Design a protein around this ligand. Structure first.
Ligand SMILES: CC(=O)Nc1ccc([N+](=O)[O-])cc1
Lengths: 300, 237
């Protein structure tokens, strides 16, 4: 079990760790988060009390180094940093634990939620989406544009998600216009899965990363990417059976975790109605359809 | 964006543009079968592709063989239209290719956009005008060449005859849409108006009768009467 210590908490802030969150008061004696499960990526995220604008945060994997948080009063935010001196770090954490200045990652043992939301997420593949050269961890905030969006205006500090565009030459084979537009199987299976991602695990990883950035930061381009990757599968008549079963599980847990009051902004009515009721896969997402109909029947 | 009453003179500027109307591409007769079920029989159709500035009409005849063995024909018809419009554009010299294509029905936007991805600089636009181009098959010479076709064929016409020698393209388009609106609202009456006087003939190389300027004013007034009437006979006013 790993630890992310905090130098201090000089400004009042709501701190998130994965799907959990807690309030820290200005200059409260808070020195970090302990008992963080090894084996999963994690996100530690922030919303200042005085400016609910800009939620921001850091994707990290404690197996890749020793990380801590320190407020920067010039740039006005909590920054993740790496400590290379392993003995200095163990000694800092041990003192903060002895003084009980840390919150415990509060995982219920029955609870597979975070695993289920991050099953295919990879932190080495977040070096494709957010290549901030030196960083082992990855900063994301509410306002970050996608690299694609720079073309419909900063791409090294943006989300380099895979460009999906259903009315593009990449998506449409000359001479197969109607076929490829109405059945996107060649775009999904040949262009994206065999040519770009390499396998479905990679496809699910970006799809899961896109959802989590939409949910935790309200990142609009991430929400667009999540829905596009869903719609590309649902609009394909030919999808490996294991992918459809896995997609139903992925989406089920995303819909389960979504805050009830954010469904208006985070869910695209058109995509979900098409996917669940009109698309080739309308009968293939039983778990997702059932939770959507019981939790958000208004949207449908 | 969409074409409407406000930007109407844009049709007659010097940027090449084409209207595309697909309402006569997929045509059927509905009939009873011997078992008393209902079935359709396709008949020949056409794509109506019109330069409103010059009057040049590219009439692509859609022979019923193109539907053989195909499903969901009303959907296929939109994609076939877009395929043929795209092939027409590719067949034209660069300097004759349109800078905009205006579709008369919004359901043609995605099919045409996808078929024209090779032409990112050609704008594909809808319109809020309710244009009467469906009535093109009430023009006898157009109906005749479509019904006689035994294979796919493209036939070129000038839908304004020689009017542009005497009037502007704005006025010519206004006359065309009046004639076609009349034919659409009451075909028999409209056709009676156009041919009542047998001393006014249709030249072999024309679609419409050889009216003088003064006879066109009378004709045009008769078509307006027809349209307002039917609008009464319809709503009782
Ligand atoms: C092309 C490609 O594999 N992208 C990608 C794969 C995985 C992730 N991820 O977060 O796990 C993100 C992006």
């Amino acid at each position: 079990m790993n630890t992310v210590p905090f130098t201090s908490a000089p400004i009042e802030v709501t701190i998130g760790i994965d799907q959990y969150s807690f309030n820290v008061k200005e200059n409260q004696p808070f020195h970090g988060i302990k008992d963080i499960p090894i084996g999963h990526v994690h996100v530690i995220h922030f919303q200042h009390a005085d400016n609910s604008s800009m939620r921001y945060g850091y994707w990290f994997d404690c197996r890749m180094g020793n990380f801590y948080i320190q407020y920067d009063p010039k740039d006005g935010l909590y920054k993740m940093m790496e400590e290379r001196d392993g003995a200095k770090f163990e000694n800092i954490v041990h003192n903060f634990k002895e003084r009980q200045m840390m919150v415990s990652y509060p995982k219920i043992d029955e609870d597979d939620t975070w695993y289920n939301l991050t099953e295919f997420v990879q932190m080495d593949k977040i070096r494709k989406i957010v290549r901030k050269d030196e960083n082992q961890f990855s900063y994301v905030d509410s306002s970050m544009t996608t690299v694609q969006e720079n073309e419909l205006s900063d791409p090294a500090h943006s989300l380099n998600y895979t460009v999906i565009n259903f009315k593009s030459r990449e998506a449409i084979r000359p001479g197969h216009e109607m076929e490829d537009f109405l059945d996107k199987s060649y775009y999904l299976n040949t262009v994206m899965l065999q040519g770009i991602f390499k396998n479905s695990s990679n496809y699910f990883g970006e799809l899961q990363f896109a959802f989590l950035n939409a949910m935790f930061f309200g990142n609009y381009g991430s929400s667009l990417q999540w829905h596009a990757m869903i719609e590309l599968i649902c609009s394909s008549a030919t999808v490996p059976k294991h992918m459809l079963d896995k997609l139903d599980e992925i989406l089920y847990y995303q819909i389960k975790t979504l805050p009830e009051q954010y469904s208006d902004i985070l869910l695209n009515e058109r995509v979900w109605n098409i996917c669940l009721y009109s698309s080739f896969q309308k009968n293939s997402l039983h778990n997702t359809e059932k939770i959507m109909e019981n939790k958000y029947p208004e949207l449908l | 964006g969409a074409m409407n009453s406000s930007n109407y003179a844009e049709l007659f500027n010097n940027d090449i543009k084409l209207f595309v109307d697909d309402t006569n591409v997929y045509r059927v007769t509905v009939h009873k079968t011997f078992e008393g079920n209902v079935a359709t029989k396709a008949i020949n159709g056409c794509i109506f592709t019109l330069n409103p500035k010059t009057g040049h009409l590219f009439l692509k005849i859609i022979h019923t063989s193109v539907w053989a063995g195909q499903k969901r024909l009303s959907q296929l018809a939109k994609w076939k239209t877009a395929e043929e419009v795209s092939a027409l554009v590719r067949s034209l010299p660069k300097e004759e290719q349109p800078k905009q294509i205006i579709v008369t029905r919004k359901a043609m936007l995605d099919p045409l956009e996808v078929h024209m991805l090779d032409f990112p600089n050609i704008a594909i636009r809808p319109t809020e005008l309710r244009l009467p181009f469906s009535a093109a098959m009430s023009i006898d010479k157009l109906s005749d060449v479509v019904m006689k076709a035994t294979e796919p064929q493209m036939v070129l016409f000038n839908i304004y005859d020689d009017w542009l020698d005497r009037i502007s393209s704005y006025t010519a388009f206004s006359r065309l849409t009046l004639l076609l609106r009349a034919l659409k609202t009451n075909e028999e009456s409209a056709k009676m108006i156009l041919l009542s006087d047998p001393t006014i003939t249709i030249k072999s190389y024309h679609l419409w009768p050889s009216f003088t300027d003064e006879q066109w004013i009378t004709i045009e007034s008769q078509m307006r009467d027809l349209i307002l009437t039917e609008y009464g006979r319809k709503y009782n006013v």
